[PDB]
Amino acid sequence: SMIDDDGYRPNVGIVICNRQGQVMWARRFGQHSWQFPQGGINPGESAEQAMYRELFEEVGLSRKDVRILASTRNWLRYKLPKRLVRWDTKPVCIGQKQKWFLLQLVSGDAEINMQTSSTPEFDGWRWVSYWYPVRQVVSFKRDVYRRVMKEFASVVMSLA
Amino acid sequence: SMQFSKMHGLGNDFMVVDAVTQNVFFSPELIRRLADAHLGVGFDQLLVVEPPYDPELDFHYRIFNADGSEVAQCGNGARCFARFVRLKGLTNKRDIRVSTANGRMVLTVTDDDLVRVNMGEPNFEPSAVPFRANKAEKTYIMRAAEQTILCGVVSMGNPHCVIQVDDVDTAAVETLGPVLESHERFPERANIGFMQVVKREHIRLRVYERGAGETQACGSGACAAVAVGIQQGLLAEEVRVELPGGRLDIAWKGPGHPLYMTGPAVHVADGFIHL
Ligand SMILES: Nc1nc2c(ncn2[C@@H]2O[C@H](COP(=O)(O)OP(=O)(O)O)[C@@H](O)[C@H]2O)c(=O)[nH]1
Ligand SMILES: [Cl-]
Ligand SMILES: [F-]
Ligand SMILES: [Mg+2]
Ligand SMILES: [Mg+2]
Ligand SMILES: [Mg+2]
């Protein structure tokens, strides 16, 4: 596995912003909750590599669909609710350690497709105001989300 | 260390806290503590900038009093909020869409860095003010006890009665004010305004509010006086207003158009405090 000894699975998060400073809000498959696209690192790939794979796997965007604007310096961690840590599966993951990327969608909105996957994680998406995700994320992700949007805000505001 | 800023607008002092990039919950106990000038900060009202509840709006903000209760007065603190989110780099827009306890507004920051608010189309219908009257006229005659006088009346959500005075420190506001505030023809009372025309685009004024009396700044009365001084025909499209609390600039094209009000917001200080 790639979980470390403390119990954190390496992860990558994606904040996709458009020209108007909105960001992409994606709904989980067969669920009510929304979030930013995030995905687990795989054995042997770097963070950027994992980002591009998960970006196409769940959002259907290619390397030429986006441009990397920024990324966080080191990892941000959040512990899962101990009501949904599967204790029987070893080595069991208690949390996730993520590195976050801010991308700007350079293609049109039509290039988004959440069906590139046999096993889609998202069935819907929309543009939302920049700070909307900080309120509307699930609570155990909120401190990470606040820090990320705080770190990325200067870049997004400095565009049109 | 929770950061904050002191700001001043409409003659009142705001403590403004960025609760977007900060994890702070304002329980009424915490608010009461921060209201203390010695143990906490010391403010007249607390303005909290929050993430929006609606994905098409930019922010939501609340205002609490020193007692720890939420205040819901239309347009309150709008000027300081709009300047604050820009000063703190929370947004770079000039037209800010924001929700409050009284609904949603759109605030525009002019490039001289003052805040413009759209407050709707004023209404002179006496049935909506309300006003005991047969129908609308540019002025009215009311006999305040032993004294006759002429006024316009308009509604901007709240009732307003306006009289021309030839200088505002030459005003018997403390005797006349209460008599027309509680006048028979105002079943829901009215904010009376004493309007001293200096030029067709410059006005000094003092307001005896509906229940409080005179306050440093009443934005409702500033738009009301200018709203009729045009309907009466004595003022221009845009009018500078000078009240004890400061200066306001008002704009209105006449019926069929909404009235805009522009005012200042001054960034006093910045602050730390450990909770
Ligand atoms: N129930 C629930 N589980 C969560 C949530 N967020 C993270 N998960 C946990 O993290 C996993 C999601 O995987 P993800 O981080 O998107 O990466 P990926 O599967 O490699 O694309 C889930 O299987 C859970 O273990 C959530 O919001 N709700
Ligand atoms: Cl590709
Ligand atoms: F995945
Ligand atoms: Mg995912
Ligand atoms: Mg995935
Ligand atoms: Mg994966």
Residue numbers in the entry:
A (entry chain B): 0 to 159
B (entry chain A): 0 to 274
The authors write:
Finding a correct substrate is especially difficult for the Escherichia coli Nudix hydrolase RppH, which triggers 5′-end-dependent RNA degradation by removing orthophosphate from the 5′-diphosphorylated transcripts. In Escherichia coli and probably many other bacteria, RppH converts diphosphorylated 5′ ends of transcripts into monophosphorylated ends that accelerate subsequent cleavage by the 5′-monophosphate-stimulated endonuclease RNase E. Escherichia coli RppH can also remove pyrophosphate from triphosphorylated RNA with lower efficiency. Here we show that RppH binds and slowly hydrolyzes NTPs, NDPs and (p)ppGpp, which each resemble the 5′-end of RNA. A series of X-ray crystal structures of RppH-nucleotide complexes, trapped in conformations either compatible or incompatible with hydrolysis, explain the low reaction rates of mononucleotides and suggest two distinct mechanisms for their hydrolysis.
GDP is too small for its terminal phosphate to reach even an extended catalytic site if its nucleobase binds to RppH in the same way as GTP. Instead, the structure of RppH bound to GDP and Mg2+, determined at 2.7 Å resolution, revealed that GDP slides toward the catalytic site by a distance that roughly corresponds to two phosphates of GTP. As a result, the 5′ α-phosphate of GDP occupies the position of the 5′ γ-phosphate of GTP and maintains two of the corresponding intermolecular contacts with RppH. The β-phosphate of GDP moves deeper into the active site, where it replaces Mg4. Therefore, the catalytic site in the GDP-bound structure contains three Mg2+ cations in a configuration remarkably similar to that observed in the RNA-bound structure. RppH likely catalyzes cleavage between the two phosphates of GDP by using a nucleophilic water molecule or hydroxide ion positioned between Mg2 and Mg3, as proposed for RNA substrates. In the crystal structure, this nucleophile is replaced by a fluoride ion located a short distance (3.2 Å) from the β-phosphorus atom, at a 157° angle compatible with in-line attack. In contrast to the second nucleobase of RNA, which inserts deeply into the protein cleft, insertion of the nucleobase of GDP is shallower and lacks some contacts formed by RppH-bound RNA. In particular, the GDP-Mg2+-F−-RppH structure shows the nucleobase of mononucleotide substrates emerging from the deep cleft and moving toward the catalytic site, causing it to lose some interactions with the protein but enabling the 5′-terminal phosphates to reach the catalytic site. With GDP bound in this manner, a nucleophile is well situated for in-line attack on the β-phosphorus atom.
